Amino acid sequence: LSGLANYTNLPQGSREHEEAENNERMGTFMGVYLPCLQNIFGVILFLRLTWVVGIAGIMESFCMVFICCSCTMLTAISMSAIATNGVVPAGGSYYMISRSLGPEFGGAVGLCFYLGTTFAGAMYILGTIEILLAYLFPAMAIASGEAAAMLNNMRVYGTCVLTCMATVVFVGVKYVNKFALVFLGCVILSILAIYAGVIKSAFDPPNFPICLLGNRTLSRHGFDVCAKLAWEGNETVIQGIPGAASGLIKENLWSSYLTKGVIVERRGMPSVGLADGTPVDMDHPYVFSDMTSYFTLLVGIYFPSVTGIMAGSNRSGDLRDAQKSIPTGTILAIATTSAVYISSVVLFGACIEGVVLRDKFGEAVNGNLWVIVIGSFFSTCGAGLQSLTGAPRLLQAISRDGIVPFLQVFGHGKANGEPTWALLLTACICEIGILIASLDEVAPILSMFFLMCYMFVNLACAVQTLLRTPNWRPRFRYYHWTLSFLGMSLCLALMFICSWYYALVAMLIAGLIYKYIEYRGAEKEWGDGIRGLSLSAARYALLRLWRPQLLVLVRVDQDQNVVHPQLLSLTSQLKAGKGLTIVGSVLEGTFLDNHPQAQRAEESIRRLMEAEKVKGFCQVVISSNLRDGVSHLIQSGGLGGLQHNTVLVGWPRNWRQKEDHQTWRNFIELVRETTAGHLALLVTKNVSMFPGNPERFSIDVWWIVHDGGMLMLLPFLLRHHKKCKMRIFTVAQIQMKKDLTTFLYHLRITAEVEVVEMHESDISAYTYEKTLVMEQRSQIQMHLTKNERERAVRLNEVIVNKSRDAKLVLLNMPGPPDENYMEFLEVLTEQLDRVMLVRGGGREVITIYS
Amino acid sequence: LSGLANYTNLPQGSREHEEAENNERMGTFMGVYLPCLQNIFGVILFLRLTWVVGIAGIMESFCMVFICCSCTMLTAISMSAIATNGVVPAGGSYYMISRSLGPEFGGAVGLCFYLGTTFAGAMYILGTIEILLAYLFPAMAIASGEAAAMLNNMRVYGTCVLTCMATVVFVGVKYVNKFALVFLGCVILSILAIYAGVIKSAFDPPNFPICLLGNRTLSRHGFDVCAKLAWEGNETVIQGIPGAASGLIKENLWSSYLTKGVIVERRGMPSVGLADGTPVDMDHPYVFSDMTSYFTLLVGIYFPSVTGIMAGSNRSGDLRDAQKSIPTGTILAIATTSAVYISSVVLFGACIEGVVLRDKFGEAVNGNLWVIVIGSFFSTCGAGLQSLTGAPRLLQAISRDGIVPFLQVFGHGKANGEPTWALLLTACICEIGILIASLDEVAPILSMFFLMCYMFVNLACAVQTLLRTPNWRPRFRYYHWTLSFLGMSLCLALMFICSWYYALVAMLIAGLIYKYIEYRGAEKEWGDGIRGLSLSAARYALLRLWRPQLLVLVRVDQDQNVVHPQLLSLTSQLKAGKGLTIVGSVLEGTFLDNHPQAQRAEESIRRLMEAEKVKGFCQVVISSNLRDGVSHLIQSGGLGGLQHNTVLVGWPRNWRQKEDHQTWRNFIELVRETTAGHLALLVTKNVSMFPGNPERFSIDVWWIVHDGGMLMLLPFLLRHHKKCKMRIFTVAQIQMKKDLTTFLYHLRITAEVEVVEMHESDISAYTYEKTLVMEQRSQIQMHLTKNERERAVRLNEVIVNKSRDAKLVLLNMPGPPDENYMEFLEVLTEQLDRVMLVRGGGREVITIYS
């Protein structure tokens, strides 16, 4: 049989995910459209929507229906955005949200959706026997102005039918498997019946009114007359008159005003007159109003009729595509119901005084070809039985995963699915919602749970897009993060409109399970608890993943003692504890023989590191050769994207001292290593006589043609720690003075002067490098506030001492040559006291604060 | 002069921090106690506190004063906790909070405190000319039932005096330096005067009442009589009578009930009688009430009289100790004012009908030896002038640091401190608070700003203690994080009691500067912006800083290709993407010559790593020798506390094949390296024939006497990925079967059997190791759910094949011997198909889920 064979509305659950994953059909969109439509036409269309049309303006209830439509369509867009970033495995919406958001939003969404559905199981079981006591045969339990006796009347019948359909769901769930299609017919025939009844628009059951009252005609069947026969009659009930209008009009209503009664008698708008001035506290045959009916009390009664869209994707796996059927079988399925709730709210501009909630001559809607008062019974029974079976099967899915540890008992089952203890708990926490025993006070409770469940989805699917989580890539139309952010804001606003003093409490509870799952999850994988949390956060911040962040290469003395703490005193003030600093070292060979040496060395360097007030990490490597215990730090510094950008090192002071030292072959191989690794180098020459604690009271930099721009960030970073003047000294072989002055003034950096120096001959030059630098520069904008200049090696001229010997000096090193490394060791320390030779890499974009 | 020489109440600020830090006195506690007391006795004690005693119950206003006392004392405890974890440098409270919390809470506290003080400058300038228009000579600006003409009256005089003391603060701030002591006398003489007046308790200025009315005696000076002379008189104003009580009683009041008027006439509690039933909408000589006076409207009018405690530490640096004077000069200074507000609220149980706000015969308090109506003028002038000078000096301190980038203009000054544009902005945003022009509506605005400023301090100083930030160690009595958490909760509750729809808005604004400072701060130090944020978060989560987190040692083929992806398929299912996994490799030498080899190798291994669904980091090291390119990974794996706990490696398959291979000396040196590094080892023997994607359908472990407990975590981790049975097989040479069965059942792990095997001889044994393990075990509890057992090497018996050849096998390796490493290569692969040899370290606590 095409269609009706193998069709339900109940969700998939836990067992049909276990089967789909252990052993590792094909319904169309029409099997995921109709279940989204079946459980969304609930009970607030048949017996409370016309009261919303009556006890509020049509131009206010239109805005109510529109904003409650947008509040859930803008979340079904996020359901479209979640159904494409993965393989949409099996089970209901819970496994989708869990495997697409981690366990942490999955628990906080699943518990709120469970608390929503387990009060849906109360709100529909409480409105399915109002029909018995108001429209079918009354079987009440007792008079004399008793308005709270109906409360105790409805409690016992509600508890009886709750035990009835909690029994019939435990045994014989194949029965509600079988009856899954007639519950759709009982909705759709009744709604087509009332559209046909509006299309008739001819007849009316008339009412009977007083002068400006309602005169509820339960037993007053004398047809609006005090006395009319051959002799007079009693009709004992008077004050002014008694007319008889016809309520079910068809031509024109113009009921576009808000008439909010407050526990008083109903009144037609200017029928004849009114003439009294006294107390009117009688209890006679008149139709009163139940409670006050302001706006924010009414939106929380309307909102449970637009809920259940994530139960429109509970049929996963059994689809054939499941990545197009979930969006187009929900957005169409929410639009085809929004069309009903918007056309019907203005298409009830035919009745007159539909503000009476219960009855005037005992009829609910009365605009159809008496069908609706039994079609709206099996519909409400089925929508209260779907929310009964579905709710324990969600506790089984939450408890099965071990996401919550004290949810251990509730994954028991009876030999094939069929949750047992979860049905007991949902019966208890539905029973504590049935003792409230009024349909208008369980709706702002149920509404708030579905609002926070819809709000956490929009909060998650907009923060996964900003914070680029790796397994988060949606493949659907729209679903932009601004749209889900508007969904967040709209769901949060409609949460605080309903009841804010419950919104804060039930959001701080739902924002507290999200930390408890994080504690019990960060304990399982790291084994520590309070450290694994911080540790896990570091792992996520690395997996989700200019200014110099450096590795400093100090060496250790004959003991486990550092040899030049002035280098640490220079790197503390170059960087000021703002960034990444790896402080490495290297020892002799064979870790077996020397691990106490490295232990005491890292203890000493960690003692030094906090004394100079620098925040970083130490790594001490034991290696056989001294060279490849440095080239095994440069290649492997930080862990992930925390790569060191540059390497700082001291000059080899005792060069050419020993006979076969080979400690400067180490240095030249280091320079070639750092340059061919695309990495910058900072070598300090006279490592002693650098200031530590003591302050000072003219930093001079020497722009050679290469590697500039880095030459002016470093004094710009040094002056923030203990402040002198600075002298830019460029070299050339004209108009660049004005360009450099405008560049230094456009940054408004400091009091930097400028001197133009022209040298006929200066080595370390190559013209085919700016064309290699511009290929990387163009691969990266407008408003370029960066320094771009248009226009045997002796190096014994050395004009950089005629205006020098004042303060810290900076220069560019020449490029390394190959053989003849001893000829590369030219030393520019003819008279320079302290100097820090720099050498940049290739890719150095220095845009802001250069 | 001892005392009065060099004493102010104004805060320190920006310039006197710059001077204290560029050039790098001695007042006692009495110079930090009295400034905390001077600006806390504001204007709501003299002209609105008695209205709170009158228009609310004394047993409700007592609870009001008590909870507003606790709300700020429980924050001054956090001010004690912040004043000891550092060196309390200079400036006001802003530099303390900034340097002790980072810039991020510092900006969000400084802006809220600035917005609090700049409306203090309005609330005191608006209540300093109510005294002119109600108690001094009226100079009003126009009658005939005009209650809003007083509003427009007060606006122009308030704007005039605001321009007056905004002018006199810009030029001649040495004048308010000079007058800083008389403003304390004008408080303390007046409050001692009213205590002396209560100590008198003898006399009274009497009033004149109607039957049950107040009869405001502005011009009705006929002394409560209709006509009394030799002839009658008019007194034209009647209804019932006119008595004349005496208000200022002394014996007994018993006014302990809440009498909340709502825009009606005042009425004594049962004076004589009342006799009328009609409309009473006249405007005659009677004292009416201004507005409704419910409780949460009144706590937000009382709260601006307990504010200003962080201006009790604005005198930093100029103290001599500053680490004991700040707590004991604030807690005593808040207790000595709480004592006043609690004794005075029950010590106004002497007056009668003090519910009239403005005047009955033109007197404010009238319980002193007329002094108070001028002592409460200079006090309010000084407390409105302190909040004028202080507020721009705080914008200078916020703008100077560059914490906020668009606050660039407001650090201008005039040649020595003296902020100029900040005074213009605080004049404008005080002027938009003076146009509200009512003292009772600028107080729930000002109150909310000081409440969120007090709430962020309690939020910061309780999260710095849980999350162990390194430069956060307080050294003061109490200051426990539960106490500051109660401060958080109490400040948040008193925030939402006042005005919740402004609480959410002005908390989402103050929770939005905290992210803008984080964006503009994480851009300055990392240069990237959106990545530096995540990067910075990783750095903080590492600096703030059992289950195996492993480094796997794969090797690369003749190309840049991996050689055994089954090892990655084993480490994907051993760990399931939950933890840290470093996937290392090693190549030939000389990085210069081989960096494209390492580039393509890490590209290939990163291609493989995501294909097996394992989340980790790859590091590829080029080194000359193949050995110390492995021992330079084991010593330096992860960056900080993300150290790899164990090393996984494949067995050398082609052992003893080449003539001089020396690839197994590598392996034995690896085993000695890993054991003497206190690190665990996992070596897979037959690396091919391990399952990848395909599932399976009897894991057997072999407990040798050493290193157990780890032997049962690994199958317990393997079965969560694709599920067979398991066989525990221990060895001995009795009662341990029952102990092992109770241990395996107490964890309720799986269907593990148990076989006891006894061998007469088995090598790799030493008895003096459990005494070395128990020294580490005792250094770590109760309810020990861990496995603790009480009771030429041949290795050719090999009884581990009589019940074997089924599934994955696990064993303990023997300890390495020294020479004769080729004799250590005994192979237990007589018939075992797949086997993963394990070897633990020393420190393996395996408490939960073993």
Ordered alpha helix ranges (H), A83-216: 93-126, 130-134, 149-170, 173-178, 182-200
HSE, side-chain direction, 13 A CA sphere, residue B238: 13
Tell me how far apart the terminal alpha carbons of chain B are, to the nearest angstrom: 75
Q: Which residues make beta-bridge pairs with B792?
A: none
**What CA–CA distance (Å, rounded) separates B529 from B609?**
29
* Contacts (Cβ under 8 Å, ≥6 apart) of B542: A538, A617, B639, B640, B641, B642
> Was A602 annotated as part of a binding site?
no
Tell me the helices (H) and strands (E) count for chain B, helix number first. Answer: 26, 10
Tokens, residue B594: 């081989």
Longest Cα–Cα distance in chain A: 144
Q: Is A535 on the interface with B (CB under 8 A)?
A: yes
- Which DSSP string corresponds to B165-210? HHHHHHS-HHHHHHTTTHHHHHHHHHHHHHHHHHHH----------
**What CA–CA distance (Å, rounded) separates B40 from B337?**
8
Tokens, residue B532: 């530096």
Phi-psi region of A6 (alpha: psi -120 to 50; beta: other; left: phi over 0): left
Closest residue by Cα to residue B165 from B432, B431, B444, B417: B431
Tokens, residue B496: 């939402």
Task: Answer whether B387's CB lies under 8 Å from B380's CB.
Answer: no
**What CA–CA distance (Å, rounded) separates A445 from A439?**
11
What value, to the nearest 5°, has the Cα angle with vertex B729 and ends B727 and B731? Answer: 175
What fold does the segment set A15-204+294-498 form as a domain? Amino acid/polyamine transporter I (1.20.1740)
CB contacts < 8 A (A, B): 157
Task: Answer whether A759's CB lies under 8 Å from A731's CB.
Answer: yes
Q: Any idea which residue has 């006076």 for tokens?
A: B293
**What CA–CA distance (Å, rounded) separates A131 from B340?**
65
Helix orientation angle between B372-400 and B421-434, rounded to the nearest 10 degrees: 130
Q: Any idea which residue has 């540890």 for tokens?
A: A405
Q: Any idea which residue has 């980072």 for tokens?
A: B102
Tokens, residue B243: 């008595």
Pairing of strands B753-758, B809-812: unpaired
Closest residue by Cα to residue A548 from A642, A635, A646: A646
Phi-psi region of A564 (alpha: psi -120 to 50; beta: other; left: phi over 0): beta
**What CA–CA distance (Å, rounded) separates A624 from A626?**
7
Task: Answer whether B190's CB lies under 8 Å from B47's CB.
Answer: no
Q: Nearest CA of chain A to the CA of B621: how many Å?
A: 6
* Contacts (Cβ under 8 Å, ≥6 apart) of A114: A391, A394, A395, A398, A426
- The amino acid at residue A196 is A
Q: Nearest CA of chain A to the CA of B11: how many Å?
A: 26
Q: Any idea which residue has 């401060």 for tokens?
A: B487
Look at the alpha carbons of A573, A574, A579, A581 in this order and tell me if their dihedral is positive or negative. Answer: negative
Tokens, residue A747: 């940054």
Tokens, residue A89: 């495995």
**What CA–CA distance (Å, rounded) separates A753 from A758?**
17
Answer whether A622 sits within 8 Å of B638, measured CB to CB.
Answer: no
Across the beta sheet with B699-703, the strand order is B617-621, B581-586, B550-553, B646-650, B680-684, B835-839, B809-812, B699-703, B726-732, B753-758
Phi-psi region of A385 (alpha: psi -120 to 50; beta: other; left: phi over 0): alpha
Q: How far is CA B544 from CA A516, A530, A533, B766, in A?
A: 21, 11, 11, 40
Cβ of B253: how many Cβ atoms within 10 Å?
Answer: 14
HSE, side-chain direction, 13 A CA sphere, residue B148: 1
What fold does the segment set A550-839 form as a domain? Rossmann fold (3.40.50)
Phi and psi for A60 in degrees, rounded to 5?
-100, -40
Task: Answer whether B93's CB lies under 8 Å from B310's CB.
Answer: yes
**What CA–CA distance (Å, rounded) separates B549 from A233?**
96
Look at the alpha carbons of A715, A716, A719, A721 in this order and tell me if their dihedral is positive or negative. Answer: negative
**What CA–CA distance (Å, rounded) separates B444 from B119?**
11
Cβ of B415: how many Cβ atoms within 10 Å?
Answer: 5
**What CA–CA distance (Å, rounded) separates A101 from A81?**
12
DSSP B120: H
Task: Answer whether A66's CB lies under 8 Å from A303's CB.
Answer: no
- Which DSSP string corresponds to A731-747? EE--THHHHHHHHHHHT
Tokens, residue B566: 């089954």
- Exposed, middle or buried, A172 (CB in 10 Å: 0-12/13-18/19+)? exposed
**What CA–CA distance (Å, rounded) separates B656 from B666?**
13
**What CA–CA distance (Å, rounded) separates A585 from B508?**
48
Phi-psi region of A689 (alpha: psi -120 to 50; beta: other; left: phi over 0): left
Answer whether B591 sits within 8 Å of A636, measured CB to CB.
Answer: no
Phi and psi for A350 in degrees, rounded to 5?
-125, -35
**What CA–CA distance (Å, rounded) separates A70 from B702?**
63
Distance from chain centroid for Cα B242: 61
Phi and psi for B457 in degrees, rounded to 5?
-65, -45
Q: Is B496 on the interface with A (CB under 8 A)?
A: yes
**What CA–CA distance (Å, rounded) separates B617 from B611?**
14
**What CA–CA distance (Å, rounded) separates B149 from A9?**
69
Helix (H, G, I), strand (E, B) or coil at A490: helix
Calculated CA dihedral for residues B344, B350, B355, B358, nearest 10 degrees: -80
**What CA–CA distance (Å, rounded) separates A200 from A197?**
5
Residues of A in contact with B635 (CB under 8 A): 591, 598, 619-622
Task: Answer whether A319's CB lies under 8 Å from A32's CB.
Answer: yes
* Contacts (Cβ under 8 Å, ≥6 apart) of B221: none
Helix (H, G, I), strand (E, B) or coil at B265: strand
Task: Answer whether A309's CB lies under 8 Å from A71's CB.
Answer: no
Cβ of B775: how many Cβ atoms within 10 Å?
Answer: 9
Annotate A771-801 with three-state secondary structure: HHHHHHHHCCCCCCCCCCCCCCCCCCCCHHH
Task: Answer whether A811's CB lies under 8 Å from A838's CB.
Answer: yes
* Contacts (Cβ under 8 Å, ≥6 apart) of B448: B300, B495, B498, B499, B502, B503, B506
Task: Answer whether B158's CB lies under 8 Å from B126's CB.
Answer: yes
- Exposed, middle or buried, B116 (CB in 10 Å: 0-12/13-18/19+)? buried
Residue count of chain A? 850
What value, to the nearest 5°, has the Cα angle with vertex A551 and ends B604 and A664? Answer: 95
Calculated CA dihedral for residues B251, B256, B260, B265, nearest 10 degrees: -20
Residues of A in contact with B595 (CB under 8 A): 676-677
Q: Which residues make beta-bridge pairs with A699?
A: A726
Q: CA gyration radius for chain B?
A: 40
Q: Nearest CA of chain B to the CA of A623: how many Å?
A: 6
DSSP B678: T
What fold does the segment set B15-206+297-498 form as a domain? Amino acid/polyamine transporter I (1.20.1740)
Tell me the helices (H) and strands (E) count for chain A, helix number first. Answer: 26, 10
Tell me how far apart the terminal alpha carbons of chain A are, to the nearest angstrom: 75
**What CA–CA distance (Å, rounded) separates A368 from A375?**
12
Residues of B in contact with A598 (CB under 8 A): 635
- Which DSSP string corresponds to B15-26? HHHHHHHHT---
DSSP B409: G
Q: How far is CA B828 from CA B131, B455, B812, B832, in A?
A: 100, 67, 11, 8
Residues of A in contact with B619 (CB under 8 A): 635-636
H/E stretch holding A453 reads: helix A439-466
**What CA–CA distance (Å, rounded) separates B208 from B242?**
7
**What CA–CA distance (Å, rounded) separates B492 from B498?**
10
Task: Answer whether B445's CB lies under 8 Å from B119's CB.
Answer: yes
**What CA–CA distance (Å, rounded) separates B93 from B461?**
15
DSSP B814: P
- Option in B526, B545, B632 nearest A531 (CB): B545
Phi and psi for B771 in degrees, rounded to 5?
-75, -25
Answer whether B676 sits within 8 Å of A595, measured CB to CB.
Answer: yes
Name the residue in chain B with its Cα closest to that of A469: B534
- Exposed, middle or buried, B739 (CB in 10 Å: 0-12/13-18/19+)? middle
Task: Answer whether B342's CB lies under 8 Å from B305's CB.
Answer: no
**What CA–CA distance (Å, rounded) separates A110 from A112?**
6
**What CA–CA distance (Å, rounded) separates B239 from B234?**
14
Q: Is B542 on the interface with A (CB under 8 A)?
A: yes
HSE, side-chain direction, 13 A CA sphere, residue A335: 7
Answer whether B539 sits within 8 Å of A580, measured CB to CB.
Answer: yes
**What CA–CA distance (Å, rounded) separates B522 from B535?**
9
Phi-psi region of B511 (alpha: psi -120 to 50; beta: other; left: phi over 0): alpha
Helix (H, G, I), strand (E, B) or coil at B582: strand
DSSP B663: S
Q: Best residue in A463, A502, A588, A628 to probe B by mutation, most B CBs within 10 Å?
A: A628
Task: Answer whether B451's CB lies under 8 Å from B458's CB.
Answer: no
**What CA–CA distance (Å, rounded) separates A239 from A216?**
16
Q: How was this structure determined?
A: cryo-EM
Helix (H, G, I), strand (E, B) or coil at A305: helix
CB contact residues (below 8 A), chain B span 599-638, against chain A? 615, 617, 619-625, 627-629, 631-636, 638
Helix (H, G, I), strand (E, B) or coil at A361: coil
Look at the alpha carbons of A266, A269, A273, A279 in this order and tell me if their dihedral is positive or negative. Answer: positive
Residues of B in contact with A614 (CB under 8 A): none
Q: Is A290 on the interface with B (CB under 8 A)?
A: no
- Exposed, middle or buried, A215 (CB in 10 Å: 0-12/13-18/19+)? buried
Task: Answer whether A323's CB lies under 8 Å from A83's CB.
Answer: yes
- Exposed, middle or buried, B410 (CB in 10 Å: 0-12/13-18/19+)? buried
- Option in A591, A632, A640 nearest B623 (CB): A632
Answer whether B531 sits within 8 Å of A545, measured CB to CB.
Answer: yes
- The amino acid at residue A116 is G
Resolution (A): 3.8
- Exposed, middle or buried, B632 (CB in 10 Å: 0-12/13-18/19+)? buried
Annotate A626-681 with three-state secondary structure: CCCCCHHHHCCCCCCCCCCCEEEEECCCCCCCCCCCCCCHHHHHHHHHHHHCCCEE
- Option in A589, A632, A641 nearest B535 (CB): A641
Q: Best residue in A580, A630, A719 to probe B by mutation, most B CBs within 10 Å?
A: A580
Pairing of strands B835-839, B680-684: antiparallel
Q: How far is CA A790 from CA A161, A662, A706, B244, in A?
A: 89, 41, 12, 98
**What CA–CA distance (Å, rounded) separates B671 from B837?**
12
Closest residue by Cα to residue B626 from B575, B677, B587, B577: B587
**What CA–CA distance (Å, rounded) separates A56 from B684?**
75
* CATH superfamily to which B546-694 belongs: HUPs (3.40.50.620)
Cβ of A54: how many Cβ atoms within 10 Å?
Answer: 22
Helix (H, G, I), strand (E, B) or coil at A703: strand
DSSP A602: H
Phi-psi region of A589 (alpha: psi -120 to 50; beta: other; left: phi over 0): beta
Cβ of B216: how many Cβ atoms within 10 Å?
Answer: 21
Helix (H, G, I), strand (E, B) or coil at A585: strand
